[PDB]
């Protein structure tokens, strides 16, 4: 008996006018945790983010790109 969370779709402009798009600007990668990276966001929150989901956040793709170059020794 599978479990699911069933949410009625709403137009995004019910939500977005009250959304500060700057909050989750990625500022830096702080450390690793298994496959994830601990990141500092501009709003002043730290969180574990999956590497393949960093591109969902402002500056996440760019930050990951540089981190990968340092991690691999190309920088």
């Amino acid at each position: 008996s599978l479990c699911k969370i069933v949410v009625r779709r709403e137009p995004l402009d019910v939500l977005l006018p009250y959304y500060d798009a700057s909050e989750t600007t990625v500022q830096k990668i702080l450390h690793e945790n298994d496959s994830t990276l601990s990141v500092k966001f501009l709003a002043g929150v730290e969180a574990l983010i999956k590497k393949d989901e960093l591109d969902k956040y402002k500056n996440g793709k760019a930050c990951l790109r540089v981190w990968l170059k340092h991690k691999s020794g190309k920088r």
Binding site: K4, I5, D20, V45, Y57
Partner: protein, 66 residues
């Protein structure tokens, strides 16, 4: 009024999560109602860090078993 990021927890200041929706890039965002009447919308990762028990309450209010 700006969300108070200087506070480690928002559990006591938030009334409820009103809805969670999905952006085109697949990220989830959540609209929250504060106890003081204000509303704000955040990436879900923010809500996970500031008031996870409110979003758990919201998800469990929408749970369905097959």
């Amino acid at each position: 009024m700006k969300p108070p990021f200087q506070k480690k927890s928002w559990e006591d200041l938030v009334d409820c999560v009103k809805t969670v929706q999905q952006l085109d890039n697949g990220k989830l965002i959540a609209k929250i109602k504060w106890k003081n009447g204000y509303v704000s919308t955040h990436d879900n990762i923010i809500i996970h860090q500031k008031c996870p028990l409110k979003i758990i309450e919201y998800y469990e209010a929408h749970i369905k078993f097959t």
